[PDB]
Structures are given as structure tokens and as C-alpha cells.
């Protein structure tokens, strides 16, 4: 009944279309949520999608402002993935940060919330409150906005707290049916951790995360399931996936420290080995939330003098808006799939014809066969919206 994901990562070629929810073209016609920071995660029949929202609808009063990124009036929304965040949406928890994974018996849900110099998470497993957790550093706790990941009814998750421009306090916790049996302090070489995208790499879990102090590389974090164990570096791949970041032809990378190019801010995003080589997604922009790529860097996970990339898809077109993506890991008849949701991010503050913030979601899925080109952007005219 546990999940152990045990079985091999499946043979990707690239990733092909899995679903899409056009939640803000909707929006303007018809009660949808206000979100931002979705992901997606699924339970061993059917995937899920989540999103942090802003206590409102978007044709609503209450959607001005909603750039702010924590009030108490967010709530991670969770539905079947490609049901849109309608007003029978379940509410899952109270959160402005959050990660959510299922076991392969029952889901577990992190939450975030409360004052940013003393929030709460909450650990809420199958459907019932199991512990609690206060900051630790008094200066926002915060985690992955992506799934969890658990072998074997030990699941994971990356917490956060403290500065967002220097030296913080990253833990990694264990948790077993919702109560934390251990915690971690992060260690290695990674210098600055957020909002990790993890997989299963049985018999451990990996991640992938922002450096939003020195790097444009973004951190490793393995996680030794077993022992509690914690290593870091950094995304060996000559060409980095952090935004901002250098243009291409000048990037450099560092397999344990961060690079210094740019790397200030960050965004959430994710990336996978796959022997030496690593799949990576990434905003076509360097310097702006615009676009969204994969491709392959052949010897990019172990040689960070690599800007070889192959098979490189355009999932958003870099005249469109993106904003997050992650990973989320679903498990075959003989193998470990990897598959990622984007984030399209609308309204304020880089779009000023509106008052709000929000976003619309499109996923695809590792593939081992074929597949060929196109966009898949947001698409409402915000010139037409609601404001
Ligand atoms: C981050 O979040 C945590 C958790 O919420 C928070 O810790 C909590 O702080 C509150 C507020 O201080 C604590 O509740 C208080 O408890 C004291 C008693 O505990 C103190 O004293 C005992 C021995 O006496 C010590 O063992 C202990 O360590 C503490 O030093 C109560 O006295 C408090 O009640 C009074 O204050 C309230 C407002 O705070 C009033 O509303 C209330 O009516 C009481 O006042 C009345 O009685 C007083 C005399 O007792 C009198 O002076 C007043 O005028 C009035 O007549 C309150 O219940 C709570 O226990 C903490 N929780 C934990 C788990 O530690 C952190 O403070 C927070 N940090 C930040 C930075 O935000
Ligand atoms: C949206 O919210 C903003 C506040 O963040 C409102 O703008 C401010 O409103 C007050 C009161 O009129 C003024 O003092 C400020 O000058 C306004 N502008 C700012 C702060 O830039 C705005 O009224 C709200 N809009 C709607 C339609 O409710
Ligand atoms: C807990 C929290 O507020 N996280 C915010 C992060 C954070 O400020 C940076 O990682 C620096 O720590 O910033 C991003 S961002 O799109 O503005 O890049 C938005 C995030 N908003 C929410 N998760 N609700
Ligand atoms: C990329 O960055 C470097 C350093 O700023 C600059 O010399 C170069 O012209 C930039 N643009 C390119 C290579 O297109
Ligand atoms: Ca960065």
C-alpha cells in the first residue's frame, strides 16, 4: 500500500502534452479562483492540481492587490488535474506557502501560515490535523510550492526560514503519517535554498531548488531517506536554470558553489539526471518570467563545462508570460515517469491593465516516443478582463 517508487526512471526523449486549464480565460466569464504558486501531484489512480489562493474569485472586489504574496486568507486549493478552480473548489488547508504529497495510502499537506516573523506549518495527514511546527528562525517559513515526496510511509519536505539574501535556515523534515519523526539540518554545499522540486530516486529523493542569494545554478538537496542524511551542490550544467541568470553564451556554473552571475531573486524550477546528462526546463528570458524551455545538457549534471544542449521543446513562447514550474513524478507499469507543470502568471505588477494577480497552469509528461512543436501560453486578453 506504501509507495516505494523502486522502479527505474522511465527513458525520456522529451515530454509531450498532458493538460491544461485556461483558468483566466475563464476567468472572465465565470466564478475561478484567484491563485498563484500551483503545482501538481497524484495519487497512485490520478493526478491532482494545487494552487495557493487568495481567499477570492477573480471577477470579485477582492481581487485587488492580490500581488501580495501572504495574507491570511490563503488557502491551498486542490481539485483533479484540468478541473478548473471553481467555486466547489476544496480548500485543503490555510496556507501562503505549502507542499502536498500522497504515500500511497493517504495525502499529506503542509501548511503554511500566519505572521511572517512567527508562522505555523501544520502537518495534516488523511484528512486529519497530525502536528504542528513553529518558525524556527522568525523570518517567513516557507517550503516547496510542489509535491512532497514519501518511500515507504517516510515522507519528505525543504523548509525554509530566514533571509532571502544571505545565509538562512534550511531543515529537512520526515514525516510519517503527518507526525515529524525527524529533522534534518540542511548540509553540504548548497548556500541558499527555496521552493526545492523533489523526486523519488529510490532509494533516496532528490531536489532541485532556487538559490535566491548568489547562484543562477540552482542547488541539489539528496535526501537519504534511511538515515536522515543530507547532501548539496549545485546543478553542474554550463547552462543554468535559474531568472534571472547570464545570457547563454556567457553563463558560467560551479558543481558545489554558486556561480555569482546574477544571482540575486530567483524563481521556482526544477531539473532531473538522467545518467550524466540532466533535463532541465527554464524561462526563455533571462532576465524576466517571459517563456519556458526543456531541453537536455549532454554531460550537464556532471561537467559543469557543458552548454551541449539537445532536444530543447518551447512549451511557452517567449512573447508569453510564465512564471513557476516544478517537477512531479508519476509511476508507470515498469517505470518512474517525471512530468512538470508551468505556471502563467497574469496581471500585476508587470501587467498594469488589471488589478489582480494570477495564473493558469499547463503540464506535460516525460515521453519515450515522439512528439513535435508548439505554444501553449495562458491566452486571456487582458485588455478585455475584468479588472
Ligand atoms: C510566537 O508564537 C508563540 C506561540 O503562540 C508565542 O509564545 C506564546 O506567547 C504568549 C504570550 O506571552 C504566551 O501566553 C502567555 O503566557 C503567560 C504566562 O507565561 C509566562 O509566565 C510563566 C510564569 O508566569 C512562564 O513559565 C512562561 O515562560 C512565560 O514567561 C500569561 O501570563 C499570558 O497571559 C497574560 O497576557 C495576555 C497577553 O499576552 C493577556 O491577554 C492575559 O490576560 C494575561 O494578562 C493578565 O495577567 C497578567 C499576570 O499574569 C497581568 O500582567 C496582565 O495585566 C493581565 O491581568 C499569556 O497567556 C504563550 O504561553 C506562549 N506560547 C508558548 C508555546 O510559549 C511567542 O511569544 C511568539 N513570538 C513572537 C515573537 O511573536
Ligand atoms: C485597490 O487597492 C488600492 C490600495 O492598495 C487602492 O488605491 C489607493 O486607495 C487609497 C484610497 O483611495 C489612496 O489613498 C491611494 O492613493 C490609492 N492608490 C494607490 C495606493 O496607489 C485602490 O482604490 C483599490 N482599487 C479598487 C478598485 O478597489
Ligand atoms: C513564503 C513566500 O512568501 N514566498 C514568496 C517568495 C519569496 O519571497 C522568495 O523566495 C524569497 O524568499 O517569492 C516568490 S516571487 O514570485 O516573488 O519570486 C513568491 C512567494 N510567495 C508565496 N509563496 N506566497
Ligand atoms: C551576453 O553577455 C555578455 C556580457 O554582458 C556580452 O558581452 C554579450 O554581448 C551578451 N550578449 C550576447 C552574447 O548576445
Ligand atoms: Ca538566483
Known amino acids: 500500500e506504501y509507495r516505494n517508487w ?22 472572465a466569464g465565470g466564478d475561478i479562483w484567484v491563485t498563484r504558486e500551483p503545482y501538481v501531484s497524484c495519487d497512485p489512480d490520478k493526478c491532482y492540481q494545487f494552487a495557493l489562493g487568495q481567499g477570492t474569485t477573480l471577477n470579485n472586489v477582492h481581487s485587488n492587490n492580490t500581488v501580495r504574496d501572504r495574507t491570511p486568507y490563503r488557502t491551498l486549493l486542490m481539485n483533479e488535474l484540468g478541473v478548473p478552480f471553481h467555486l466547489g473548489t476544496k480548500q485543503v488547508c490555510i496556507a ?29 495527514y488523511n484528512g486529519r490535523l497530525v502536528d504542528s511546527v513553529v518558525s524556527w528562525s522568525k523570518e517567513i ?11 515507504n510511509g517516510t515522507c519528505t519536505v525543504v523548509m525554509t526560514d530566514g533571509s532571502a539574501s544571505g545565509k538562512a535556515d534550511t531543515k529537512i ?22 521552493e526545492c522540486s523533489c523526486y523519488p530516486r529510490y532509494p533516496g529523493v532528490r531536489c532541485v531548488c532556487r538559490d535566491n542569494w548568489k547562484g543562477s545554478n540552482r542547488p541539489i538537496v539528496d535526501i537519504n531517506i534511511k538515515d536522515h542524511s543530507i547532501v548539496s551542490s549545485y546543478v553542474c550544467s554550463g547552462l543554468v536554470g535559474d531568472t534571472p541568470r547570464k545570457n547563454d553564451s556567457s553563463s558560467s556554473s560551479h558543481c558545489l558553489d554558486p556561480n555569482n552571475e546574477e544571482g540575486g531573486h530567483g524563481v521556482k524550477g526544477w531539473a532531473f539526471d538522467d545518467g550524466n546528462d540532466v533535463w532541465m526546463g527554464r524561462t526563455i528570458s533571462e532576465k524576466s518570467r517571459l517563456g519556458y524551455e526543456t531541453f537536455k545538457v549532454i554531460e550537464g549534471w556532471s561537467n559543469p563545462k557543458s552548454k551541449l544542449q539537445i532536444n530543447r521543446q518551447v512549451i511557452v513562447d517567449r512573447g508569453n508570460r510564465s512564471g513557476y514550474s516544478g517537477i512531479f513524478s508519476v509511476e508507470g507499469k515498469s517505470c518512474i515517469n517525471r512530468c512538470f507543470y508551468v505556471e502563467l502568471i497574469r496581471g500585476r505588477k508587470e501587467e498594469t491593465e488589471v488589478l489582480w494577480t494570477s495564473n493558469s497552469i499547463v503540464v506535460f509528461c516525460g515521453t519515450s516516443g515522439t512528439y513535435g512543436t508548439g505554444s501553449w501560453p495562458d491566452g486571456a486578453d487582458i485588455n478585455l478582463m475584468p479588472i
Open 6 to 27: 523502486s522502479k527505474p526512471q522511465c527513458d525520456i526523449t522529451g515530454f509531450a502534452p498532458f493538460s491544461k486549464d485556461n483558468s483566466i480565460r475563464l476567468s
Open 96 to 124: 501562503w506557502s505549502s507542499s502536498s504529497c500522497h504515500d500511497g495510502k493517504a495525502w499529506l499537506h503542509v501548511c503554511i501560515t500566519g505572521d511572517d516573523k512567527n508562522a505555523t506549518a501544520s502537518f495534516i
Open 141 to 151: 517559513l516557507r517550503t516547496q510550492e510542489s509535491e512532497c515526496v514519501c518511500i
Open 173 to 194: 523534515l520526515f514525516i510519517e503519517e503527518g507526525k515529524i519523526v525527524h529533522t534534518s539540518t540542511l548540509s553540504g554545499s548548497a548556500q541558499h535554498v527555496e
